[PDB]
Design a protein around this ligand. Structure first.
Ligand SMILES: [Cu+2]
Ligand SMILES: [Cu+2]
Ligand SMILES: [Zn+2]
Ligand SMILES: [Zn+2]
Lengths: 151, 151
């Protein structure tokens, strides 16, 4: 598949629609998320597309290469590490990401997995603690959705 | 992936959790759906895992071999044609399906696609009108969910 989509939903006011398109050896991620507190929010692909227990059942950050957490620009990062999305004063974040590691096909495809937007900013593994190199201290999962094949 | 899961949600009271497991050379579908009217309800894999416009954006039945609609035991059927689930008087349908056309990896993969449960019975393509050859006259989509990779 060359296109994918994900509708984010949660137990709070946060919602959004994320679009994915394969371009060359990258995936262009677009869309928007609303209902967020002003500022940065961690944005990652989690391993399982399992919504049986809210966003908790999505598991850890997608990490097929068994690396530590990092920012999208780092060599040492989880495949699912897409950094931060930024919400304005009105709580709207416009997603504009081009990533070379996530894919929509092959062993490390994100189709069927989960997109999660977090409570706090992702410190990109530069927080000086063991949680920084695991989750980026992004906090709780505000909303998530299973990534599906799009027309 | 050898296991998948799908959480069904809609605008009404219908909900459910569907499990998929690759066993041997086939796929075993289990789970349950609640809030249904007593009797049969069409149950199919739809093409897109797109929930941007509710269950409508899931598109038509998954049909990579370009066939007409049928029952799961028919040669002429859509890959997504899993027939009917049956709800008891309490509105509970126990899903128990083994299917030879769907898969969880490759050309026939339903990962990233959508499961839909319908308002009415699926006539298995034998209704006699054009609609039967497309949807089995199963009618509206009561609940649906994107099929994700499970642990
Ligand atoms: Cu995350
Ligand atoms: Cu259907
Ligand atoms: Zn990570
Ligand atoms: Zn069909």
């Amino acid at each position: 598949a060359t296109k994918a989509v994900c509708v984010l939903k949660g137990d709070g006011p946060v919602q959004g629609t994320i679009h994915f398109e394969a371009k060359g050896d990258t995936v262009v991620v677009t869309g928007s998320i609303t209902g967020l507190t002003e500022g940065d929010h961690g944005f990652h692909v989690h391993q399982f597309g399992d919504n049986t227990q809210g966003c908790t059942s999505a598991g850890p950050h997608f990490n097929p290469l068994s690396k530590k957490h990092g920012g999208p620009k780092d060599e040492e990062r989880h495949v699912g590490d897409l950094g931060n999305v930024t919400a304005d004063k009105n709580g709207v974040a416009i997603v504009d990401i081009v990533d070379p590691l996530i894919s929509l096909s092959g062993e490390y495809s994100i189709i069927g997995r989960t997109m999660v937007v977090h409570e706090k900013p992702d410190d990109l593994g530069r927080g000086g603690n063991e949680e920084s190199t695991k989750t980026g201290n992004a906090g709780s999962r505000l909303a998530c959705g299973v990534i599906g094949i799009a027309k």
